[PDB]
Amino acid sequence: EPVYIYTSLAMIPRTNRLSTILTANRIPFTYRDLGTDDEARKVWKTFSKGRSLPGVVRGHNDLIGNWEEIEEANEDYKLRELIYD
Amino acid sequence: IRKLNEKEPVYIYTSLAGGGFHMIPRTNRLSTILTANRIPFTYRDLGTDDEARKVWKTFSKGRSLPGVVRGHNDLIGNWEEIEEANEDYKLRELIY
């Protein structure tokens, strides 16, 4: 399943940190800009439960976590949380 | 398999970490033009998007980024070609 970093390009530098963490864990990703991407907007609004952007989404609508949660999985180094939910 | 009975998606191919000459201002200008013609789009970042990178390398003919692409690989035009066209665009994306 493809992995995305949900963002708002017009969110904050935190996107760059997220990108660095995924690359470090050899996780390929592409960006999704909620400023222009209605699918991403729908997914983030439905599932974020008020969590702030940015974040990581797998496939069409599997919200893995926002930046803070991704940070947390990374210091536990279980960021490959996102392939097993 | 792919979904039927819908419009081909439209992309602005760009490089979000810049580098390319006037990459961000030209991207911003492209965005304004597409929005002006009421054309929905998403960005493709060639820095992280390998297929978008491959598409541009194959079809750009040396044209500089950013540009507009329809579907998987229908390069409509780069920023300059798109700039000139700003008479009717809808015709070049939807009628072609």
Author numbering:
A (entry chain B): 1142 to 1151, 1157 to 1231
B (entry chain A): 1135 to 1230
Paper text:
Here we report a previously unknown budding yeast polarisome protein encoded by YFR016C, named actin-interacting protein 5 (Aip5). Aip5 is found to accelerate the formation of actin filaments in vitro through its C-terminal folded-domain (Aip5-C) and mediates actin cable assembly in cells. Structural studies by X-ray crystallography and biochemical assays have identified that Aip5-C is in a dimeric form, in which the dimer state and a loop region that directly binds to G-actin play essential roles in regulating actin assembly activity. Here we report a polarisome protein Aip5 that aids in actin assembly in vitro and promotes formin Bni1-mediated actin nucleation directly through the interactions toward G-actin and the C-terminus of Bni1.
Therefore, we designed several constructs containing the C-terminal region and identified that one version spanning residues 1110–1233 (referred to as Aip5-C) displayed high solubility. The crystals obtained diffraction beyond 2.0 Å. The structure of Aip5-C was determined by the selenomethionine-multiple wavelength anomalous diffraction (SeMet-MAD) phasing method. The crystalized Aip5-C forms a homodimer, in which protomers A and B consist of four β-sheets in the core region flanked by four α-helices. This structural arrangement can be subdivided into an N-terminal β1α1β2 motif and a C-terminal β3β4α3α4 motif, representing a typical thioredoxin fold. Interactions within the dimer interface are predominantly hydrogen bonds that are formed by water molecules (3, 5, 10, 18, 20, 101) and two β2 strands to stabilize the dimer. Interestingly, superposition of Aip5-C with cGrx2 revealed that the substrate glutathione disulfide-binding site (CxxC motif) of cGrx2 is replaced by a hydrophobic loop (SLAGGGFH) connecting β1 and α1 in Aip5-C. Superposition of protomers A and B showed a root mean square deviation (RMSD) value of 1.5 Å, which indicates high similarity between the two protomers, except for the lack of clear electron density for the loop region between β1 and α1 in protomer B. The loops located in the region of protomers A and B in the Aip5-C dimer run almost parallel with the heads of α1s pointing toward each other. Structural study guided our identification of an Aip5-C loop that directly interacts with G-actin, which is necessary for Aip5 actin assembly activities.
